[PDB]
Amino acid sequence: KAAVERSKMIDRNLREDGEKAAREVKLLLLGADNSGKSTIVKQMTGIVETHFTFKDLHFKMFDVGGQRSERKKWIHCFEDVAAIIFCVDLSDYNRMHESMKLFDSICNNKWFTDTSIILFLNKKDLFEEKIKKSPLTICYQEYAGSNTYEEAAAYIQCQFEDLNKRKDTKEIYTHFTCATDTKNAQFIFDAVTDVIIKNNLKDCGLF
Amino acid sequence: ASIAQARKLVEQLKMEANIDRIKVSKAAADLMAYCEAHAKEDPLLTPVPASENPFR
Amino acid sequence: ASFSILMSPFVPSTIFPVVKWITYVGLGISIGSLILCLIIEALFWKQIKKSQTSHTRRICMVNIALSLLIADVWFIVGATVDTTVNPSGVCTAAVFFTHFFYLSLFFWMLMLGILLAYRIILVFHHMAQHLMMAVGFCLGYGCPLIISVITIAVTQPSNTYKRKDVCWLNWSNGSKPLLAFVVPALAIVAVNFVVVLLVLTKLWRPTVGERLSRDDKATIIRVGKSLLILTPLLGLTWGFGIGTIVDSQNLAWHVIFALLNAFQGFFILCFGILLDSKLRQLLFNK
Amino acid sequence: SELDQLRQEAEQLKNQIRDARKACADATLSQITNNIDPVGRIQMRTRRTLRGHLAKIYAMHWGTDSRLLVSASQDGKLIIWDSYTTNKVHAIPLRSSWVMTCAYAPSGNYVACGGLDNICSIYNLKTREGNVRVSRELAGHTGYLSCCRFLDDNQIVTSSGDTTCALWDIETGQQTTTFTGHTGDVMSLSLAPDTRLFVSGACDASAKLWDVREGMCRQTFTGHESDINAICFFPNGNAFATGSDDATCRLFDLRADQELMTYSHDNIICGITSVSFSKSGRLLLAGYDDFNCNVWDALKADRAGVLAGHDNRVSCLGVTDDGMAVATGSWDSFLKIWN
Ligand SMILES: [C][C][C][C][C][C][C][C][C][C][C][C][C][C][C]C(=O)O[C][C]([O])[C]OP([O])(=O)O[C][C]N([C])([C])[C]
Ligand SMILES: CC(C)CCC[C@@H](C)[C@H]1CC[C@H]2[C@@H]3CC=C4C[C@@H](O)CC[C@]4(C)[C@H]3CC[C@]12C
């Protein structure tokens, strides 16, 4: 039958594209407006899909945030992602409060109970000079401890990691982004390859 | 901004207000009448014989 | 019997009175442990299992469980029958099946051990699920069958296939059919041991990036849990076979080898399944 | 400021609206259909199990001839099935893999898609050159496309996540009519059998009935307290049923302008994902997030049957025009035909 042969041809194409799409990392990108997401995506409308290849691995990044609608009605389709990329602009202070709330919402979703976070603390170079003009302790009601960068930067990590209520099932990876971009893509690959390695352990009844 | 929205919102209620509403019991009987009229034409309700069933 | 004969060229007479009691209890509860393990697995074989990698582990676990159950019942009836009344009716047949099923059990644990090694170093390398299933059965059963048939086709015509005391492969001095079982057993354990250390390195990997220490002693409890569940399923308790080969006269080694391996059925139900929190809550409630 | 006076004027109009509905609320359909015999327990078996999708199936639409079936999945492939023989006719590689709705034209010549890409894509099935191609690419919505239905070969109505429904002309690719009034994101819409008036359910727990020719909200129904996810007309066309995130299906009458039935159970606590009606309208089929569907008697609010057999949340279902079978597409990438 010609119709049966047509279905067989279609099946080959479906499986051919399925294995091709099975190697896609399929990451999810979030963050505040103008929070350094451009640097983390351009190192090489609604949501935009960006693709870059690193070490013979193809990555898909979805810049969610341009929808401006009820996120809970379409955030369930972003499951099965390898991890979540978060961008925090350390230079901005007023946008940090909404960034923490946005980070709080994503980590506590019932869909994202196991997806890791590879949050990036951007603009660390501009944070050195800007903190001198306006101290972190004075700007925020909560105490920032020592004014040194070795403690102020670590304080931001404490305020972000503690938002994760699921410590056991989620592994937050933190990195600082600088002018160079060669190592920026390396961290994503290292973080992703650690998640898939760890994910196999749960499926093998080991973790 | 909000003044224009309030002006348009109140006009919609007035348009919706002056409509003809029949009795619920009269409307309820119409739904029951339609189901009884097309009861024989519902293959899901009445088990279709496999001879004329295309999904058998 | 003493259950040490599987790996023991000679069983001393002093251990036999004391070692026989623990192994019979161990074999007895092993049969019951496997029955419950298979029953609970059969009900929830595919209802909750959907991952492609988890698909491979389910078939490996039932194959290990199935091999141990049938081999154990063949072993218990292979030692309770006299070798003179029925030297071939019940004694010869039991030895071949016991030897082949144990070899299948050893080789199946290699497939499970290789599978863990495959998903750790070759994380991005993906082959078809059916292709992995086909090659696993070919080596899980076909390779032990290849070794088993040549064992009965070489030693048996020489009439040195049967030990006088017990229905099991003879040791002798000229013909050593037991090498067809001892050597594969140590080879699988040795290959499994390096797989064990490979998992240990991944759990002990340093923090990626500038992540703080955060929780303390969180990784060490995973290590203890991993070795508790991985040791019986990989047959790491069978490593004592080399100890009884070299000396075969130690009081302690025969006891520990007998009790640990005879209880492997209990270490599968209690540790392989019950310890697994993924299926632990789904079973206790109902 | 005259804003306070306007709000008071609007408030008293709502009181008049509910008082007028309360006058006819004395009679209830639940106490009227107690005399008719119940449909009883009904059994449905999976005659066919369409497989081939590699991701969650969000939408499906039955063919106008009750034979062809189109489904959309997050894998990025839109597949037209032959339900009789399980065969596959087409497999469209959608440009955007984030598809949330799909429609099959009543003439059987066009298929539409849409989702997080903010645009509606229409594909010409009957192409003389062989492989199908994107006939038109409707754009203009600032929110995700939640639903789309074909009025004819040149008219399509779309539900968007910008609290606005629109009617599009395929030839020019422009919004002929824009429907506004929803304060929440519109999730679904249903067309009347005469394709003259349609009702859309939104996230503001309200279903508004619109007029295609005019472009105005004729009626508004507020019976739910959560997001409305499923809208389906009665076969007669004078009533429709709504599915919400409260495991409650409510039947509204257009002429009575009041909720009639409330299909709910104590056991179910999930949310409705899709609803449908049989040819006679006596049987109501509603999708659920608890991995299985339910069958409701539309005149007695009794659970006539259960359509369990899916390993994940049921996302879409539909009944053929001839009412011969009901399909169901869940998140386990499997389409099942029940009869
Ligand atoms: C029935 C159930 C089922 C069963 C399970 C199991 C089966 C099979 C096994 C395997 C499979 C196959 C293998 C692969 C390998 C490759 O390819 O590649 C290599 C290079 O790459 C090389 O690598 P290296 O690094 O050198 O090493 C490796 C090692 N191992 C262990 C992994 C092998
Ligand atoms: C990690 C723990 C739980 C299990 C270890 C199992 C294996 C690796 C152990 C158990 C018994 C061990 C043997 C015990 C005694 C001897 C005799 C001497 O020649 C040293 C090596 C040798 C031959 C050991 C080799 C390693 C061995 C086979």
Residue numbers in the entry:
A (entry chain A): 10 to 53, 182 to 230, 241 to 354
B (entry chain C): 7 to 62
C (entry chain R): 567 to 852
D (entry chain B): 2 to 340
From the article:
To provide further insights into the autoproteolysis in modulating receptor activation, we also determined the miniGi1-bound structure of ADGRF1 with the proteolysis-deficient mutations H565A and T567A introduced in the GPS motif. Of note, a similar stalk–TMD interaction mode was also observed in the miniGi1-bound structure of the proteolysis-deficient ADGRF1, which shows that the cleavage is not required for the stalk exposure and subsequent stalk-induced receptor activation. A similar stalk binding mode is observed in the structure of autoproteolysis-deficient ADGRF1, supporting a cleavage-independent manner of receptor activation. Indeed, the proteolysis-deficient mutants of ADGRD1 and ADGRF1 exhibited a wild-type level of basal activity in our functional assays. One possible explanation for this proteolysis-independent activation is that the receptor may exist in multiple conformational states; these are likely to include a portion of receptor molecules in which the stalk is released from the GAIN domain, which leads to a collapse of the original folding of the GAIN. The dissociated stalk tends to interact with the receptor TMD to trigger G protein coupling, which, in turn, stabilizes the stalk–TMD interaction on the extracellular side, and may subsequently induce the stalk exposure of more receptor molecules by altering the equilibrium between different conformational states. Alternatively, the cryo-EM maps of all three G protein-bound ADGRF1 structures display strong densities for a lipid molecule bound to the intracellular region of the receptor.
